[PDB]
Amino acid sequence: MPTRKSNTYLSLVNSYLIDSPQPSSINYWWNLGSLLGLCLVIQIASGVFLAMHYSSNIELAFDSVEHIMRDVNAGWLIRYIHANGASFFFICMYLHI
Amino acid sequence: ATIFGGAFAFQGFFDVAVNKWWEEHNKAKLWKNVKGKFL
Amino acid sequence: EPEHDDRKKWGLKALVVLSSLYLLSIWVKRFKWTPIKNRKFRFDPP
Amino acid sequence: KYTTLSNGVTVATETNPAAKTSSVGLFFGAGSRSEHSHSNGISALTTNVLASQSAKGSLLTAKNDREFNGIIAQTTNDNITEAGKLIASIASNAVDIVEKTDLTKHKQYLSAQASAVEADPKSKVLSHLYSSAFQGYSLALPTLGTTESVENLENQDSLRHLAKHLVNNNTVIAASGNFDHDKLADAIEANLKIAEGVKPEIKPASFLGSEVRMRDDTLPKAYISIAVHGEGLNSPNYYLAKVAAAIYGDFYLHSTIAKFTSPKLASIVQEYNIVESYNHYSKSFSDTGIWGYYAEIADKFTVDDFTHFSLKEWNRLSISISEAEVARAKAQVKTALAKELANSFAVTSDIAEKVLLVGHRQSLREAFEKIDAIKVNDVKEWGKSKVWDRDIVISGTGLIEDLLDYNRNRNEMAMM
Amino acid sequence: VQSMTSVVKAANFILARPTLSKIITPLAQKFTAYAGYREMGLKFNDLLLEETPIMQTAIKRLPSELNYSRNFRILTAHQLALSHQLLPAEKAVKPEEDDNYLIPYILEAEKEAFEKAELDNI
Amino acid sequence: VQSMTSVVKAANFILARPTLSKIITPLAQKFTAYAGYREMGLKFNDLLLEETPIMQTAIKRLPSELNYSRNFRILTAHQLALSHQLLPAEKAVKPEEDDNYLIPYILEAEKEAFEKAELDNI
Ligand code: HEM
């Protein structure tokens, strides 16, 4: 069998991405799920890069966020992503519902 | 692979195009162009 | 908003890249779907 | 040996003293490729009507090929000359024979044949593949016509077909066996009397990558076929195309040698018994060809696996074919050519086909010399030109739910 | 989900009474024409929710010709939705061809299921 | 994993020479006695790594009686390891019964595989 089916890991990846027998008449709405998954990555990805700089102490939380925005190299980008990407995560989730 | 190297071509092309258009659209506003007046 | 200038320059670069890439994706999808949107069926029972 | 008689008709004969039986036949080109949708199958009907005439002890049979038609009168060696006269008569009175004919019975016979080619899964698959590959042109039409078009043919249609195509410039008398060529030529000259006319212009045809799926879930297997634009009889790659086809050769799962056949695809598909059988072929028409394989898969869940592996093995054609595979393919193609040219009936059919469609027939020794000149680099160049990344035409009959749509198979043609 | 037994019960409850019949039936045809499924080649019974054991049995007990015609109509509907185009008026399914072909089989399936349920609680 | 063909090549390379034979063979018997597999009912060829296409083919081509005997010996070994007990010396597999029953089939499978590999690279 092809490597994309013999190997269990690639077999799973195939069953879900490469050979998943999707119906032929699905609109673009059925893509929202993927976006949601994409957003779940982004929320996590940017998220993991904010905790590397976010300090959870109450006297430091807001100052730490401002340190991210002002001092970290791309910190403004990471915060704006992690926030507007949550807003878009919920846009896509409401569209998926 | 050649994907890694080729990505540099497009990244550099767009980066230089934008970093040459931006300092032309905004040349009257950037610092490096205004600093002369206040020196 | 000290990142304003850098933020908008990065945004311009991102829009250029993503808009070109989105047009390319549109073209590729329409092209690879031409076989499906051009399917023609027949049903000829006795 | 060739002799152009009066009327300009050419008698071509390949006489061999070792021939078991003799054969002589008149072929007048213009098979299904010369027809059109409304009058499709008229060539086959006309040839059947002519071949149904009194045989005077010989064996009169119709040819009914895609691009040429003819009547062949097999007979033992000493009787050959008589058979000659017979066919000559049958063709000098072709219009009379057609006029005096009640086409009813011949039309049910032709309809039975057309149903046969639409029931035998391989015949159906290959006919559909040819139709879809050359769709829009006369070459797509069945050799024997469809059941819907056969019933709509009348005597005047056959008469018009004969008048257009049964002319000296478009007809050849082919022969083989053990006999004196001059005797047969003289016997035919005194008896052959056919209308003058210019060789009809052979209709154009162009390959079009396409897919046709006649999924019948009631069948027990999946009969598929996949092919690319091959090499016509004119192309100098003709034998090179045959060598490329033989590199992958045949395979029957239940045959004893199934576990020992050289081709790599055979070893690949036996690991999980992906396919029941397959055969690679290079069908060659006058100017265009279909190079590919036919396959029957018993397990309906492994059609995709077979297509994937077969197209990967095709990809190997342009990169990694070894001198062992090329030498094996050369030897097997030479042996297959020599086998195809043993029976006098086959030799006569081959002579007619070549002389009508390319004008000159390469002797078997010349063909062997041309094949032995092939090196592995020539085969890989041909694979790059014609197989690597070229559009494919697909066909399938039953349990083809697992045959993934075009794009998958087409993209398999270029992945490394 | 509502059983075809109950749907037909309500439909015959309405159809028997002339006032409700006159008021609804024109509205029923108008609703079925505005539904827009006929423009895609689908008969009404093609729309039914197949993913139920009763309905699966009903299809599994269809004749050959009806089964193949249903397959072709469903495939045509999928293709039309895929290509974002509709059948012309002349090719669409006419009101008289929407013949409720699958309802009897579903009703038989529900009759069998209801008898089994009733007897299990005898 | 070492192909059984190579193991037999080495074994005959040693056995052919009288000095190496006289030295090793006593140590060979002593090592197979100390191995401890015989006290659990297993012959040597039961220990072989089954999870290989060559070995799997060799097992698939065993005679019926040898196949059933192997199955029972493996089952007995599993039970003994499960109950943490060993067979008494009178019931343990004696050196004479450790007869190398599976090696011929393994060698045939190896020969077939090596011929196929050699011809594939002709
Ligand atoms: C679906 C999953 C998630 C959603 C929808 C989400 C959404 C959000 C939103 C809306 C905020 C508000 C931030 C602001 O308004 O500035 C936030 C804050 C934050 N999130 Fe996430 N988040 C997700 C997962 C994660 C993960 C996996 C991490 C891992 C570190 C993370 C780390 C953070 C941090 C550190 C903040 C603090 C905000 C800041 O310092 O600017 N989030 N999240």
Q: What are the residue ranges spanned by the domains of chain D? A: 1-192, 198-416
Q: Which two tokens stand for residue C16?
A: 């250029």
Adjacency order of strands within the sheet including D22-27: D2-4, D10-15, D172-177, D22-27, D70-75, D59-62
Cα–Cα distances (Å) from D121 to D128, D214, D400, in that order, read 10, 11, 13
Residue that has been written with the tokens 């090549």 in this structure = F9
Q: Which of these, D230, D216, D66, lies nearest to D133 by C-alpha position?
A: D230
Q: What is the domain extent for residue E10?
A: 1-122
What determination technique applies here? cryo-EM
Cβ–Cβ gap C36/A77 under 8 Å: no
Parallel, antiparallel, or unpaired for β D2-4 and D10-15? antiparallel
Distance of CA E52 to the CA centre of its chain: 14
Q: Is A82 annotated in some ligand binding site?
A: yes
Resolution to 1 decimal place, in Å: 3.0
Residue ranges around ligand 1 (CB below 6 Å): A 40, 43-44, 47-48, 50-51, 54, 65, 79, 82-83, 86, 89
Burial readout D11-34 (b: 16 or more C-beta within 10 A, e: otherwise): bbbbbeeebebbbbbbbbbbbbbb
Give the strand order in the sheet containing D392-396. D211-213, D392-396, D222-229, D289-297, D277-284, D250-252
**Computed from CA positions of residues E50, E53, E55, E57, in that sequence, does the dihedral angle turn out positive or negative?**
positive
d(CA D207, CA D228): 8
Instruction: Check if the beta carbon of residue D316 is closer than 8 Å to that of residue D294.
Output: no
Q: Which residues pair with D393 in a beta bridge?
A: D227
**Residue of D296, D245, D281, D317 lying closest to D403 (CA atoms):** D296
**Probe residue for ligand 1, chosen from A64, A67, A76, A82 as the CB with the greatest number of ligand atoms within 8 Å:** A82
Number of cross-chain residue pairs from A and D with Cβ atoms under 8 Å apart? 7
C-alpha D319/C-alpha D322 separation (Å) is 9
Among chain C, residues having any CB pair with chain E shorter than 8 Å are 36-37, 39, 41, 43, 45
Give per-residue burial for F82-101: e unless 16+ CB within 10 Å, then b: eeeeeeeeeebbeeeebeeb
**How many folded domains does chain E comprise?**
1
Residue B19: HSE in the Cβ half-sphere, 13 Å Cα cutoff: 8
CB count, 10 Å around CB of D146?
20
- Does any CB of chain B come closer than 8 Å to the CB of residue C12? yes
> What residue type is E52 in one-letter code?
T
Q: Give how far D367 is from chain A: nearest CA, Å.
A: 39
- Whether B18 and C16 have beta carbons less than 8 Å apart is answered as yes
Cα radius of gyration (chain F): 17
Q: Whose CA is nearest to atom 3 of ligand 1?
A: A43
Cβ pair D24, D17 in contact under 8 A: no
Phi and psi angles of residue D177, each rounded to the nearest 5 degrees, phi first: 130, -150
Contacts of D42 (CB under 8 A, 6+ apart): D35, D145, D153, D157, D158, D161
Distance CA E47, CA E41 (A): 11
Q: Are E43 and E69 in contact (CB under 8 A)?
A: no
CA distances from D201 to D27, D163, D169, D357 (A): 16, 14, 11, 12
**Alpha carbons A16 and A10: distance in angstroms, whole number:** 10
Query: What is the C-alpha separation between D287 and D285, in angstroms, rounded?
Result: 6
**Alpha-carbon span D161 to D46, nearest angstrom:** 8
Q: Rounded distance, CA D253 to CA F93, Å?
A: 44
Q: Which residue has the tokens 């729309």?
A: E47
Q: Which residue type does D308 have?
A: H
Find all residues with CB under 8 Å of D318, minimum gap 6, and list them.
D380, D383, D384, D387, D388
**Residue keyed to tokens 């199955």:** F71
d(CA D283, CA D292): 8
- The neighbouring-strand residues paired with D225 are D294, D395
Residues in contact with D284: Cβ distance below 8 Å, sequence separation at least 6, in sequence order: D230, D231, D232, D233, D238, D241
Let me know if A72 is exposed, middle or buried by CB neighbors in 10 A (0-12, 13-18, 19+): middle
By three-state DSSP, how is residue F18 classified? helix
CB atoms within 10 A of CB D82: 15
